[PDB]
């Protein structure tokens, strides 16, 4: 339609030339920022030899609103604030990142564009000038301290990468490279460690698990942060931090941004606050049932056009048997209020001293979410006469839930109450009637779960073990 | 196929000229998408265009040979 109108306009021009249009443009000149942006777009589609690839690097500059100065054909520098880098403020050029060099040498200008975007976002810092340089210095001190704390754990125990990620001080930590900021891997779920039995090695993927990024971000309030490495003296077991003041009251705090917001319960907010003290949610926003938020996080990991419309009755298909799980949100906790929680994306900590405690609470909340999360599925199990064993999850208390199922051999309801005491540790008790058939041994179920993964899965093992006996 | 290539060429020239002229008058994603679509058509059939000519020269040689053989047979 628009194209047809444009063709009609071209026919009108033919009836009326390109030379005449050029003359008209010259007359207008004799008589801007969007044209500059348009230049970058058509220069991005331009792809030719090395000279035009240097003009493609110039296109990348104005695409991200950067300023390009080139000395000789070999060196071109994009400069803004302290974000100045050269492909051949207040700091030396840090490294010839292989990551950036490999992408440029190969035909991946798009990857170089993403890396610049990351650098620009890291330095989106408001501040001013001398304050920005000091604020970056504080981030450098935090990074050095966190790196040392990770090294201490490796010296104390030569743990494999998996142990460090699941149960270690800090976490597997990759030092910042270019735009990407430090990533601490809080948890690696057993089901997702296995892909289609992965052995981590030191080659652990950046996204193969749950990852959190440490960064400095400006805040309305004013806080005191270390401006020099605070682990001057380290006690051989764990760490010792020299007391503040050095430090300055910059109007910002260190942050622990999570790439995908993690649903967290009201009880966790209190347990976490007890240590740090910094308000986790400050301006009290919204707080609805936790089980709904857990479903949204699990369902939205893979996006599909049709909303599941689960009605909290998720259907699961497994190698043996078919199961239906009702998540039972709105079940009253002992207090009389249903488990209620709000997605948290950013957690702010002044020093790393409270960080070991904060992470241990988060690991427990993440682990509980993963076990309950494994059930949430997009199943259209309609009119299923065979099996369709039906289980219901009720929130007995914060940190506890009960999966209720009919006894596999007998007829009474039997309930397994699982409490997520720690991120990697869950304690479960089977409740069975006085007259009943010994359904299972708590240890056999544990062995199967650890070797495999998830909780829709745990119910299968309980049913199979009972049937085998 | 020849007709399709010629149509793609004409569309590309006119639309590229229009986009450049509008940039000049100021100081067009519809035009951009149209350009890349017919650019793919021309480029994919330009490897073909080159080989076609080589194949045509080979065909001419074959034809000459066949003609000679027939005339000789006759």
């Amino acid at each position: 339609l628009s194209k047809m109108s444009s063709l009609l306009e071209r026919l009108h021009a033919k009836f009326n030339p390109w030379s005449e249009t050029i003359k008209l443009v010259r007359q207008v000149m004799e008589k801007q920022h969007l044209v500059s942006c348009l230049e970058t777009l058509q220069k991005a589609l331009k792809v030719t030899s090395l000279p035009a690839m240097t003009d493609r690097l110039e296109s990348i500059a104005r695409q991200n609103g950067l300023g390009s100065h080139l000395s000789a054909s070999g060196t071109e520098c994009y400069i803004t604030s302290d974000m100045f880098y050269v492909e051949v403020h207040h700091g030396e050029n840090p490294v010839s990142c292989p990551e950036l060099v490999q992408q440029l040498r190969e035909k991946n200008f798009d990857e170089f564009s993403k890396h610049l975007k990351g650098l620009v976002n890291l330095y989106n810092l408001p501040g001013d000038n001398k304050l920005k340089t000091k604020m970056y210095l504080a981030l450098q001190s935090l990074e050095q301290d966190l790196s040392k704390m990770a090294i201490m754990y490796w010296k104390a125990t030569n743990a494999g990468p998996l142990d460090k990620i699941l149960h270690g001080s800090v976490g597997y930590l990759t030092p910042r490279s270019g735009g990407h900021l430090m990533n601490l891997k809080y948890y690696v779920s057993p089901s997702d460690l296995l892909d289609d039995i992965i052995l981590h090695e030191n080659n652990v993927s950046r996204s193969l698990g749950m990852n959190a990024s440490v960064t400095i971000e400006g805040t309305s309030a004013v806080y005191k942060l270390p401006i020099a490495p605070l682990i001057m003296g380290s006690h051989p077991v764990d760490n010792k931090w020299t007391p503040s003041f050095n430090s300055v009251d910059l109007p910002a705090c260190f942050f622990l941004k999570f790439p995908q917001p993690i649903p967290v319960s009201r009880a966790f907010v209190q347990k976490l606050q007890n240590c740090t003290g910094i308000p986790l949610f400050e301006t009290q926003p919204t707080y609805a049932p936790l089980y709904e938020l857990i479903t949204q996080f699990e369902l939205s990991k893979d996006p599909d056009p049709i909303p599941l419309n689960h009605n909290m009755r998720f259907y699961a298909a497994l190698p043996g048997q078919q199961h239906c799980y009702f998540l039972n949100k709105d079940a009253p906790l002992p207090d009389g209020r249903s488990l209620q929680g709000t997605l948290v994306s950013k957690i702010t900590f002044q020093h790393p001293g409270r960080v070991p405690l904060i992470l241990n609470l988060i690991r427990h909340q993440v682990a509980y979410n993963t076990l309950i999360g494994s059930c949430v599925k997009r199943t259209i199990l309609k009119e299923d006469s065979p099996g369709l064993l039906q289980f219901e999850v009720c929130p007995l208390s914060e940190s506890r839930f009960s999966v209720s199922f009919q006894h596999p051999v007998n007829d009474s309801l039997v309930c397994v109450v699982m409490d997520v005491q720690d991120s990697t540790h869950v304690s479960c008790k089977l409740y069975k009637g006085l007259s009943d058939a010994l359904i299972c041994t708590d240890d056999f179920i544990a062995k199967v779960v650890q070797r495999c993964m998830s909780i829709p899965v745990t119910m299968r093992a309980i049913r199979r073990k009972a049937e085998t006996i | 196929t020849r007709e399709r290539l010629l149509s793609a060429l004409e569309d590309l020239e006119v639309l590229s000229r229009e986009l450049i002229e509008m940039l000049a008058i100021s100081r067009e994603n519809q035009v951009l998408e149209l350009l890349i679509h017919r650019d793919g058509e021309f480029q994919e059939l330009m490897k073909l265009a080159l080989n076609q000519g080589k194949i045509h020269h080979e065909m001419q040689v074959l034809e000459k040979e066949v003609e000679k053989r027939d005339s000789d047979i006759q």
Binding site: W18, S19, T21, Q42 | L23, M46
Partner: peptide, 29 residues
């Protein structure tokens, strides 16, 4: 063909009429 068209667009961004005439000759080619 497409490279010549992009070069004409780059000339328009820089600004000429001679380059547009060159684009017409490229269409004859």
């Amino acid at each position: 063909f497409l490279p010549l068209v992009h070069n004409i667009i780059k000339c328009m961004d820089k600004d000429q009429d001679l380059n547009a005439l060159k684009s017409k000759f490229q269409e004859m080619r």
